[PDB]
Ligand binder design. Sequence first.
Ligand SMILES: [Zn+2]
Ligand SMILES: [Zn+2]
Lengths: 145, 78, 21, 173, 127, 196
Amino acid sequence: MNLLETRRSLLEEMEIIENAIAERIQRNPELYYHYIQESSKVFPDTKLPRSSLIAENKIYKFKKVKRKRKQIILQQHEINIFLRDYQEKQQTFNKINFERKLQQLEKELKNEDENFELDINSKKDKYALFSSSSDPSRRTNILSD
Amino acid sequence: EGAEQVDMPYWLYKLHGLDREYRCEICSNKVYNGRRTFERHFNEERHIYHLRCLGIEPSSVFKGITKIKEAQELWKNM
Amino acid sequence: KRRKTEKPSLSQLKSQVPYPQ
Amino acid sequence: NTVYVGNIDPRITKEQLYELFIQINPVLRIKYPKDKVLQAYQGYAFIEFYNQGDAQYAIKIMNNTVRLYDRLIKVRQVPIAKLFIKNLADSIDSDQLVKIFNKFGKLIREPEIFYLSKLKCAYVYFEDFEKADLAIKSLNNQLVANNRITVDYAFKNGKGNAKYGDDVDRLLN
Amino acid sequence: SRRDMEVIKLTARYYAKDKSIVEQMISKDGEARLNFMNSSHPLHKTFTDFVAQYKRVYSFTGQEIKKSKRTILDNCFERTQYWEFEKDKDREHDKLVELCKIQFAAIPWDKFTQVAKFDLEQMRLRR
Amino acid sequence: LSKGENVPYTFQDEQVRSNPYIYKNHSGKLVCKLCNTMHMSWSSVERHLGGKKHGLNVLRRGISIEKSSXXXXXXXXXXXXXXXXXXXXXXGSVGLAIQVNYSSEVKENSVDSDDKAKVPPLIRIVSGLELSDTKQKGKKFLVIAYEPFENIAIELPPNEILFSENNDMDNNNDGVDELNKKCTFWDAISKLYYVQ
Ligand SMILES: [Zn+2]
Ligand SMILES: [Zn+2]
């Protein structure tokens, strides 16, 4: 097994997760804001956003719809498990990090030529594995798969 | 989701008289969508086939036919 | 209404006619 | 009575057609279309004679005879039972259908095989409403090729009405 | 597609270290298998991705990532912020375009006053 | 208003017509053979042509052929800018390139109220079939326009030059049209509009 591929897939998954919890923080800034505010009173150094942003529930220009408490908390616990995954992958990654061989492997790649099958499930199954509304048919449950 | 704030000849077929519900009884209780079209049914292959094969001979006396029954007594009058 | 719906069929009218067409 | 004529040069005019066919028989009427869009003759006409005797005569003598603008002139003379059948077997050939329904009644045309829903169905054309009633009576809800088939009238709503027996009887007559 | 994927990613693995092994392989074998090497073949683009990615793994080899929870959160927030910014740029652009359409639609193309009668992409930049 | 054209009567058994449609029947009135509409004066005729009715009948006749097989407030000093035409060539054919220069902060110092100031010059291909004088015609013009300055035109006898085929990779910001995004550059910092 070429470690390059494994470490690659790792960095890629980490990227995917960051992107997910970032999309979340995007749709409803409260998710971060809420959190950050509390953090403020535990670790005094923490820099917190402009009050106006917090109130208007906006991150830059667009003011986002206010969400109810149950959902905010939910997504916060979801992001919690996400960050857990991330921490794990980061860990394993830290613990993990010619021509004749090129043709050597390219030769074995000829193995099982008759494999009629469409393969669109590596980044899609992950991207999907971590996105909003991943449970219902279309749009019923905010929770990711 | 995404409610962010900042900071064809309709009158023509009625005018012409088409796409209006109508039915011919002698032909398969068939439906016709226009009165001009049904007035064109009077001279047709299948309509004359229903008449002539029915025993009611073709052309212009029977034009105003709708139901199968009345034109039978009309043909007895013929 | 009733007079509009009272009308005889045109084929009923043909029989009264010597030149029905 | 009326004869179709075709392969006509648009330069052939109405008086030229008349003078042409009066040589054959007397001509009652001539309908010789004129395109409004192109303002030209579309190259085929209709000549209505005084009877189908002169009509057929002109069909026999006139066909492949006169040569106008190097192009030859052409002359040509100018309701059944339908049963829907559902859940057919995939091993049932159209010819096998023909064999199955011939014993009940003569077919005016060939069956029509189509797929609904996966679901093999066919339209069978009988020349007789009564023979259609026979194929219905015997073949309705029956097992052929180890598959249960349903035999009824096809929609037009469905065939087999009271006026349908009356007029189909006449078309048989 | 597992075959294509595998060959792309493998030739990408080797191409990431030397870039000389593939340029030799192409001349040695002569197989329509590696037809993605030319920028003509669509997949080529994705290739340019994979290699880059592998090139990246070579970046911090011997260095560990010690990002903490706080930090990861801060980062995801900043990414969000970026996305919002980009979104705003897109919006503005759409607006300007709209203006242009209005004015173009609203000027006299019959006020003629002619005189005579009869690469830009690298030019539409700055240097 | 007739622009000196001679419209022959319908019965005169058809010199090429501008529009082979408007005729005069046996009487003196003017008619549209397609539309079958009578018109008293040539002004009414022009209303008919500029009307959607006639156009619809034109599209219907074309279908028959296939079957048979901000404007108000626009500042205008009408000042002719300076163009610099030059025969170009690349690969694999020949194309034209124009270099239009604009004012050097001479008069644009009095108007800076973000009123379409962000809008760059615009180009359009116009057929000479329509002119204020309507005398001669039959060729195209590559008109270039900017709010204050006066319009400019360049005659294009060649049916097609530099009319490329999918130059970029189909990206959709229509701006004004495929022509403008496809082949124009607006050096707004120096006020130089290039077109090719
Ligand atoms: Zn009928
Ligand atoms: Zn008109």
